[PDB]
Amino acid sequence: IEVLAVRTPDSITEIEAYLNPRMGQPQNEDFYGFSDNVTVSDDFGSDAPPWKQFPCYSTARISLPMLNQDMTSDTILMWEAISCRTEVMGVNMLTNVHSAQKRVYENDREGTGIGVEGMGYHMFAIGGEPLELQFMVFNHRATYPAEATVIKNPGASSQVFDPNLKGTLTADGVFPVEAWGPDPFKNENTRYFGQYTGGTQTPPVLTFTNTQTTILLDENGVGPLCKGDGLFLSCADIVGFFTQHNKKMSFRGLPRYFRVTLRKRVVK
Amino acid sequence: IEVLAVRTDSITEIEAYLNPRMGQPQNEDFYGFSDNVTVSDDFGSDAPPWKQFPCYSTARISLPMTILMWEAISCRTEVMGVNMLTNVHSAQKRVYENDREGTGIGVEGMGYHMFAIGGEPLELQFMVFNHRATYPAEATVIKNPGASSQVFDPNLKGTLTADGVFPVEAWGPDPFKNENTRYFGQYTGGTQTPPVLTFTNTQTTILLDENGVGPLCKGDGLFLSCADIVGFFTQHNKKMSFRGLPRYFRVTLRKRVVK
Amino acid sequence: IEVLAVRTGDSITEIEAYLNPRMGQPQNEDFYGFSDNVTVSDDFGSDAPPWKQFPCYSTARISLPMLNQDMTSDTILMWEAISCRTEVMGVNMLTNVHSAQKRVYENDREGTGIGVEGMGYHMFAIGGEPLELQFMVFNHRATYPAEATVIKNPGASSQVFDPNLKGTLTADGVFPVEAWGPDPFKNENTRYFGQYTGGTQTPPVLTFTNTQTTILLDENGVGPLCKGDGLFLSCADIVGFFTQHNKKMSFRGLPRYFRVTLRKRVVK
Amino acid sequence: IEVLAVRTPDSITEIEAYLNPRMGQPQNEDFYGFSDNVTVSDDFGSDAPPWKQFPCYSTARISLPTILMWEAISCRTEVMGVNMLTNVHSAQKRVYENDREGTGIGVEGMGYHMFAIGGEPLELQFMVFNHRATYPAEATVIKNPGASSQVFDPNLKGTLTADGVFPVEAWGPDPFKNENTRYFGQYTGGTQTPPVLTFTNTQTTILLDENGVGPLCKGDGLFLSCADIVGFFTQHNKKMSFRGLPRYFRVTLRKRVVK
Amino acid sequence: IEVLAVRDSITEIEAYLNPRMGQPQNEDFYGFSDNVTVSDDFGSDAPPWKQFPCYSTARISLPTILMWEAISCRTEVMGVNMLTNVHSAQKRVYENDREGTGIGVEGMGYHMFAIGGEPLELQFMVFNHRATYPAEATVIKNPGASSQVFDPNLKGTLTADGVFPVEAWGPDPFKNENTRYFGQYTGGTQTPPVLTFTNTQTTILLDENGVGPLCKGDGLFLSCADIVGFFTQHNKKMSFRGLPRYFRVTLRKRVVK
Numbered sequence A: 001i002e003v004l005a006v007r008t009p010d011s012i013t014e015i016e017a018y019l020n021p022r023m024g025q026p027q028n029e030d031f032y033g034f035s036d037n038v039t040v041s042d043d044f045g046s047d048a049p050p051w052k053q054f055p056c057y058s059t060a061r062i063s064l065p066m067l068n069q070d071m072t073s074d075t076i077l078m079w080e081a082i083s084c085r086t087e088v089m090g091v092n093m094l095t096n097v098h099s100a101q102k103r104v105y106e107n108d109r110e111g112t113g114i115g116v117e118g119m120g121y122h123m124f125a126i127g128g129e130p131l132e133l134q135f136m137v138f139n140h141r142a143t144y145p146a147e148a149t150v151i152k153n154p155g156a157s158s159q160v161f162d163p164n165l166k167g168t169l170t171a172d173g174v175f176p177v178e179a180w181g182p183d184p185f186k187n188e189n190t191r192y193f194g195q196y197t198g199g200t201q202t203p204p205v206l207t208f209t210n211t212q213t214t215i216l217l218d219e220n221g222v223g224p225l226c227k228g229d230g231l232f233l234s235c236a237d238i239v240g241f242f243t244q245h246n247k248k249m250s251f252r253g254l255p256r257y258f259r260v261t262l263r264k265r266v267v268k
Numbered sequence B: 001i002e003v004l005a006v007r008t009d010s011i012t013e014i015e016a017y018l019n020p021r022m023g024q025p026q027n028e029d030f031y032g033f034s035d036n037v038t039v040s041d042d043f044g045s046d047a048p049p050w051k052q053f054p055c056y057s058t059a060r061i062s063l064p065m066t067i068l069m070w071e072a073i074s075c076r077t078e079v080m081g082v083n084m085l086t087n088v089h090s091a092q093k094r095v096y097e098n099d100r101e102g103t104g105i106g107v108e109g110m111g112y113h114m115f116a117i118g119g120e121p122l123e124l125q126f127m128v129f130n131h132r133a134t135y136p137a138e139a140t141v142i143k144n145p146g147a148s149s150q151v152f153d154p155n156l157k158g159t160l161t162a163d164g165v166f167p168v169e170a171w172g173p174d175p176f177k178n179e180n181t182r183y184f185g186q187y188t189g190g191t192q193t194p195p196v197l198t199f200t201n202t203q204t205t206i207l208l209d210e211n212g213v214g215p216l217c218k219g220d221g222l223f224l225s226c227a228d229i230v231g232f233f234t235q236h237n238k239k240m241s242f243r244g245l246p247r248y249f250r251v252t253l254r255k256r257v258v259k
Numbered sequence C: 001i002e003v004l005a006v007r008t009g010d011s012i013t014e015i016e017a018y019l020n021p022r023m024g025q026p027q028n029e030d031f032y033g034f035s036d037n038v039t040v041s042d043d044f045g046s047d048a049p050p051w052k053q054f055p056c057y058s059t060a061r062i063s064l065p066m067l068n069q070d071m072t073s074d075t076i077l078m079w080e081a082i083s084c085r086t087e088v089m090g091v092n093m094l095t096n097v098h099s100a101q102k103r104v105y106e107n108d109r110e111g112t113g114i115g116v117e118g119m120g121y122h123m124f125a126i127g128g129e130p131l132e133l134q135f136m137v138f139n140h141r142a143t144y145p146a147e148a149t150v151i152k153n154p155g156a157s158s159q160v161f162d163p164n165l166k167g168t169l170t171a172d173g174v175f176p177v178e179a180w181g182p183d184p185f186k187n188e189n190t191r192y193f194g195q196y197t198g199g200t201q202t203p204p205v206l207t208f209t210n211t212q213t214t215i216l217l218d219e220n221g222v223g224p225l226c227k228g229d230g231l232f233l234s235c236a237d238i239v240g241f242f243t244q245h246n247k248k249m250s251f252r253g254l255p256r257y258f259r260v261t262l263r264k265r266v267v268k
Numbered sequence D: 001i002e003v004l005a006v007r008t009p010d011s012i013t014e015i016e017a018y019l020n021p022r023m024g025q026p027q028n029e030d031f032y033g034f035s036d037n038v039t040v041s042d043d044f045g046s047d048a049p050p051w052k053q054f055p056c057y058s059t060a061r062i063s064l065p066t067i068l069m070w071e072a073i074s075c076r077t078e079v080m081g082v083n084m085l086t087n088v089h090s091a092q093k094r095v096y097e098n099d100r101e102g103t104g105i106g107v108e109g110m111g112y113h114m115f116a117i118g119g120e121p122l123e124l125q126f127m128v129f130n131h132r133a134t135y136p137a138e139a140t141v142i143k144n145p146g147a148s149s150q151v152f153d154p155n156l157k158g159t160l161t162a163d164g165v166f167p168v169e170a171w172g173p174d175p176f177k178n179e180n181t182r183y184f185g186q187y188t189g190g191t192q193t194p195p196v197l198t199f200t201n202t203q204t205t206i207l208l209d210e211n212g213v214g215p216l217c218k219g220d221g222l223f224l225s226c227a228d229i230v231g232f233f234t235q236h237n238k239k240m241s242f243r244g245l246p247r248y249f250r251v252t253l254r255k256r257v258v259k
Numbered sequence E: 001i002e003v004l005a006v007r008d009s010i011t012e013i014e015a016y017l018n019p020r021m022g023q024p025q026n027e028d029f030y031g032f033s034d035n036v037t038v039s040d041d042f043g044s045d046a047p048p049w050k051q052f053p054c055y056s057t058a059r060i061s062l063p064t065i066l067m068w069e070a071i072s073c074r075t076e077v078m079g080v081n082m083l084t085n086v087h088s089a090q091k092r093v094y095e096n097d098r099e100g101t102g103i104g105v106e107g108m109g110y111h112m113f114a115i116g117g118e119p120l121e122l123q124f125m126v127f128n129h130r131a132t133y134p135a136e137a138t139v140i141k142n143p144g145a146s147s148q149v150f151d152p153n154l155k156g157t158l159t160a161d162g163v164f165p166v167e168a169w170g171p172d173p174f175k176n177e178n179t180r181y182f183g184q185y186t187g188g189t190q191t192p193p194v195l196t197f198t199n200t201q202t203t204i205l206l207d208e209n210g211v212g213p214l215c216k217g218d219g220l221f222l223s224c225a226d227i228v229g230f231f232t233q234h235n236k237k238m239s240f241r242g243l244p245r246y247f248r249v250t251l252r253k254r255v256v257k
């Protein structure tokens, strides 16, 4: 794409969208927002995580307003994503230490719940085309379930970087977070942002405000250009683990808010 | 609201406090605390009793009476009474309980610190850890909110219109609304987490949006909201209660012409 | 006070001062810098913290040089504080893990002392008049000893904010840290800065440098104005707890350094 | 090298490269990305860390397109595969081992993240926890380094000239050299520390020095070096191995006239 | 000490300070203290020589009058790489199972450096005033109860390497007009060490007036302590582990009265 002039009163639009988490349990059922209880393999050889027990990436394509093209010009207008605000919603719910939680003083049947604790994985991506993925796994001999999208028998090389093992995030709730990450060799037309804090007893730390704005412009002053007039949102928002009295543990996820400002860009 | 020129007599300043609503009744010996937290066995038999969970604090501040509206341009906010957390002697589980020795363990665990300042009530998203929780009659909640309530459901909206009754654990700020409010929030989780608090009279936050417009005080009302969970108070017998702290606000407003 | 012009030539001065901590144990006896061993009540109603077992605020008024007043002027000169350096001194001493401390591996009588750990409370205030206080307590039914300055029988409202419960920090070593904090409704003529990190096994975190200057000027470019030609300094520097082999714990505090640059200001 | 004027497309090139980690286990086999299970010696005197049980630096030379030299002016770098650390099912010691319940504990313990970009091999200082350690034949070390190798000895020098054979625990960047290399490094210690990693394609680091000069690529060669220890993998039987991640590099060079 | 204009003219020195954690140099525990013993009370407290760290220090010789003025510095904790060692005679993560890595180096961090035109000026201050320091150590003997906090009588200067106990001396903020000092402390005995290294960080040494330290007698004074944490043996004996510090200083010629 040959990028040309920015248009400056009717040249800018705003979209707002949410992505619900895909932590593994089905929508419209009692554990929506959570994974199912996590089972652990005895070895890498026999490792087979069941469907529902691991999170997947969230994705959506947002259809943009009419650009009102110039019928006789040899150029076209494209929506250019210039800025965003993103917030993890429902942080407030993590003040719940009463709902069926392993207690601080289990031996005394006393104390609050321990609440949600452990690993936070927070990433979002805003592009003019689907997020480009690198396949990479902890254990290449893991047998993923039929419901999941992965590279089957990916080989030892998939435990680190293999340039043959590529993907694109083309479907919501089926690309396992533990098997796909953003590809830094691609995503020329996406901005991605990721933070990981590991562990299983780590205090979760989350902020929320409606006062924060991230500029989406690259080093040439060009934001994502929305090919076929779509805006591609991707995320994963693991808050940590929910622990039952019987010590079963499940992933807990939260939904993400996006506001994206776009402006009209002349191209070609 | 169409926003015209800043009027430049033109400036006012209010100070206010919101006391915390951790659950125990005001004017009684456990004011500032929740009652002792009980935990359900399962999501299906989950009814957190009244007094055992915190609620948002809120207040409408009356301001002096094309039109002029009061426009909020800056604030200072301070969590008050941080000093009281140096108390490790008041009926606290001890560091070496099995020796009946050491300090009290003092206040530890989750911090949830949020404030909002706007020209109308805080717009809220309903969201809960367990949709099947039965909240007490005293609480304001969406009843039988459905499985969708565990994540984002665009039907499940509310506005913060009463002090001490909107459970923190069931409402948060709606990012899809609040064009006329600035909100700020931090959560640190856990039950033995060290609390981290700062205080100073030297910090101003600017409340102007990208367009240089502050919150515009509809009907000459300034809306303040907070929640300041500091962590938990643990008794000798291991019973745990939320402890909260009051919040100071100073807001600077200017006359702005509109319509 | 009506505030007029700055003098910029004679017109500048610096004072340096220390405040020693008032953690509870008497001065120039063997436990100076410490509290006595902390006792814990069984309930709120029978809560009576003995004198010496809890810290108090440090404060001093510093006498300033003669201003050399213009005898015939309608106006008057005051000293205006414009900047400070402050440092917690003796941080070096906390590398001591041999001095009668509970050992890391007590069941094996082995390892270092555990050293000082637990809550940090670090605050300082620089003003032209005494620090204005808000009375607030964890437990209102606490009976403070006669040695201590408190509001007696303050009632339930004292557990949160009650606008009736005020004070000024008019004496060193007697205002319990746990019952008084800075009053954000007053202190127009004082700058105060406070940090708390809780717990009883929290690692203390402290920094020291002679390269850090804090400006004391308000939004109007006016510093604290020294009424009756006094500078008021206040602090509390709880570093954490000292734990003995028998598991007795005391507060440990450190002294604070102040450097304050003042300049002549004309006022009505 | 006398450094004259910047030549201003055809004057700018951009390379991209990955460095796979060298945690110890062989390439293209089932434990690629890990060390073998760590053994611990009884004393300094008889301390022989076996080949495969310790990490080594990753390094590559990239071949690039009055003389003209390539001058590295900026980079992006990213630790890849951070996403795999959300795996708590793969043969991991469980949170509640006694009850055979909970997630795996996942990767925890020490983080060591370092990268270097230079016009020549990274210049190294030899320094070791225990000088009496006997390294295996596969490792490049200074043999019989002496007690002074446990701190700084100006005699104990090297350059990173070989991928996967310079042990991290024996070699670090030499601050007395590396005039023509930029290095960055962070260590967080412990064995139960939570790993903290970030990733984004939006961060650029400028490689120009105080004089506006970046690494100048000798022999038309760009030198990349790293080590990315994420933490430890703990089996059900409490055996612990290093886990590493590959690092991405993007480097932007310009033609520089030199003498 | 009146300063005129900045006046061939710019020079740069590099130095290293090895750590003085207690164990004698060029012997097998160089970089470590000896195993720490703990007193039963303040009254009998007598830390043995080799069981506590001392400050490192050196004077570097440099090449109306002219003085060398220190304008900027680079400093680096060297050898952070060695802390990836979890095999060398360390208490194991799962000692009851004789399994896991070593726990490695853990506990308190104390990192301080000073760059000045004269010896670093010290304030004497001790946890316990009744501690008896050994003959080898430079201390104020019988310093009294006020030495547990600030006493203005209890001053010193860092005149010697490896003999001023870290736990007895810190920088005096009432003096050091011609030194820049920087310190960080993180306590605990199981705290994770956090260390960074780059050749890309330069600290400016100019004061508010734009004057850096002026090197009296053409001597540059370098001081540091870098306690990274503790080494714990299988038998639970614990010793300080320290690391050496790199210093790059840029000096320019300043005219003085």
Ligand SMILES: CC(=O)N[C@H]1[C@@H](O[C@H]2[C@@H](O)[C@@H](CO)O[C@@H](O[C@H]3[C@@H](O)[C@@H](CO)O[C@H](O[C@@H]4[C@H](O)[C@@H](O)[C@H](O[C@H]5[C@H](O)[C@@H](O)[C@H](O)O[C@@H]5CO)O[C@@H]4CO)[C@@H]3O)[C@@H]2NC(C)=O)O[C@H](CO)[C@H](O)[C@@H]1O
Pocket: A042, A043, A044, A045, D031, D036, D037, D091, D235, D236, D237, D239
């Ligand atoms: C992630 C996964 O699937 N892990 C499962 C696996 O663990 C093995 C792997 O982690 C390998 C990776 O190299 O490491 C094994 O541990 C060995 C290995 O580290 C070795 C050095 O390379 O040192 C020890 O083994 C010693 C010796 O070298 C071995 O040859 C010897 O092996 C004997 C067997 O133990 C006997 O059962 C057999 O009859 O005869 C051989 C002798 O020829 O054992 C020596 C120590 O006694 C390390 O232990 C990992 N193995 C183990 C036991 O953890 O496989 C195990 C089941 O073995 C689990 O399924 C694990 O989940």
Ligand SMILES: CC(=O)N[C@H]1[C@@H](O[C@H]2[C@@H](O)[C@@H](CO)O[C@@H](O[C@H]3[C@@H](O)[C@@H](CO)O[C@H](O[C@@H]4[C@H](O)[C@@H](O)[C@H](O)O[C@@H]4CO)[C@@H]3O)[C@@H]2NC(C)=O)O[C@H](CO)[C@H](O)[C@@H]1O
Pocket: A031, A036, A037, A100, A244, A245, A246, A248, B041, B042, B043, B044
């Ligand atoms: C939060 C709450 O109310 N929890 C209570 C609930 O726990 C059950 C739920 O958490 C569900 C969520 O899917 O999982 C149950 O555990 C199951 C499943 O994870 C299942 C896979 O879907 O795998 C295990 O069950 C298998 C098998 O599928 C079962 O049909 C079979 O009977 O048992 C197998 C295991 O041996 C796994 O156990 C949770 N059940 C238990 C137990 O925790 O319900 C329980 C009472 O049953 C408690 O009240 C919880 O508080």
Ligand SMILES: CC(=O)N[C@H]1[C@@H](O[C@H]2[C@@H](O)[C@@H](CO)O[C@@H](O[C@H]3[C@@H](O)[C@@H](CO)O[C@H](O[C@@H]4[C@H](O)[C@@H](O)[C@H](O)O[C@@H]4CO)[C@@H]3O)[C@@H]2NC(C)=O)O[C@H](CO)[C@H](O)[C@@H]1O
Pocket: B030, B035, B036, B091, B235, B236, B237, B239, C042, C043, C044, C045
């Ligand atoms: C800080 C302090 O001084 N605490 C001492 C006090 O503890 C009691 C308080 O913490 C109050 C605060 O409301 O709670 C008591 O626990 C009760 C309540 O939480 C109650 C519901 O409001 O629920 C429990 O009581 C139920 C039932 O509701 C009661 O009517 C019944 O008599 O007992 C039931 C037992 O399940 C809960 O226990 C605190 N009481 C105890 C006990 O902790 O008084 C105690 C000694 O009695 C100690 O002195 C505390 O230090």
Ligand SMILES: CC(=O)N[C@H]1[C@@H](O[C@H]2[C@@H](O)[C@@H](CO)O[C@@H](O[C@H]3[C@@H](O)[C@@H](CO)O[C@H](O[C@@H]4[C@H](O)[C@@H](O)[C@H](O)O[C@@H]4CO)[C@@H]3O)[C@@H]2NC(C)=O)O[C@H](CO)[C@H](O)[C@@H]1O
Pocket: D042, D043, D044, D045, E029, E034, E035, E089, E233, E234, E235, E237
């Ligand atoms: C790192 C290593 O290889 N450690 C192995 C070693 O441990 C010994 C070393 O740590 C040295 C370093 O100086 O200290 C020994 O501990 C001794 C000393 O600290 C000593 C004072 O210098 O104080 C203690 O010993 C005293 C006395 O001085 C001794 O002469 C007397 O025999 O015993 C006294 C106390 O009862 C202190 O114990 C370390 N020794 C031990 C033991 O830990 O050697 C041991 C086995 O000898 C292990 O192999 C270590 O892994």
Ligand SMILES: CC(=O)N[C@H]1[C@@H](O[C@H]2[C@@H](O)[C@@H](CO)O[C@@H](O[C@H]3[C@@H](O)[C@@H](CO)O[C@H](O[C@@H]4[C@H](O)[C@@H](O)[C@H](O)O[C@@H]4CO)[C@@H]3O)[C@@H]2NC(C)=O)O[C@H](CO)[C@H](O)[C@@H]1O
Pocket: C031, C036, C037, C100, C244, C245, C246, C248, E040, E041, E042, E043
């Ligand atoms: C740091 C050090 O050297 N500690 C050793 C020392 O411990 C004693 C000191 O900590 C002093 C400091 O004031 O306190 C003793 O504890 C006492 C006091 O806190 C006291 C009130 O001032 O309260 C307790 O004692 C009361 C009563 O006052 C006593 O008269 C009576 O004998 O016992 C009462 C309680 O039953 C409290 O115990 C420290 N004493 C002890 C013991 O910890 O001295 C001891 C030997 O006694 C050890 O050598 C310490 O390491």
Ligand SMILES: CC(=O)N[C@H]1[C@H]([C@H](O)[C@H](O)CO)O[C@@](O)(C(=O)O)C[C@@H]1O
Pocket: A039, A040, A041, A042, A046, A047, A048, A049, A050, D089, D090
């Ligand atoms: C990640 C993984 O492989 N999980 C597997 C688990 C665990 O191996 C065991 O629960 C440990 O005993 O075993 C199953 O039979 C189960 O519980 O459903 C099947 C599942 O494929």
Ligand SMILES: CC(=O)N[C@H]1[C@H]([C@H](O)[C@H](O)CO)O[C@@](O)(C(=O)O)C[C@@H]1O
Pocket: B089, B090, C039, C040, C041, C042, C046, C047, C048, C049, C050
């Ligand atoms: C804070 C507090 O109330 N402390 C009180 C302590 C503790 O309650 C007990 O030591 C617990 O057993 O008891 C006293 O008898 C004491 O030891 O002097 C009275 C003192 O006022």
Ligand SMILES: [Mg+2]
Pocket: A184, A185, A186, D016
């Ligand atoms: Mg590319």
Ligand SMILES: [Mg+2]
Pocket: A016, B175, B176, B177, B179
């Ligand atoms: Mg909106």
Ligand SMILES: [Mg+2]
Pocket: B015, C184, C185, C186, C188
């Ligand atoms: Mg006021």
Ligand SMILES: [Mg+2]
Pocket: D175, D176, D177, D179, E014
């Ligand atoms: Mg050099």
Ligand SMILES: [Mg+2]
Pocket: C016, E173, E174, E175
């Ligand atoms: Mg001075």
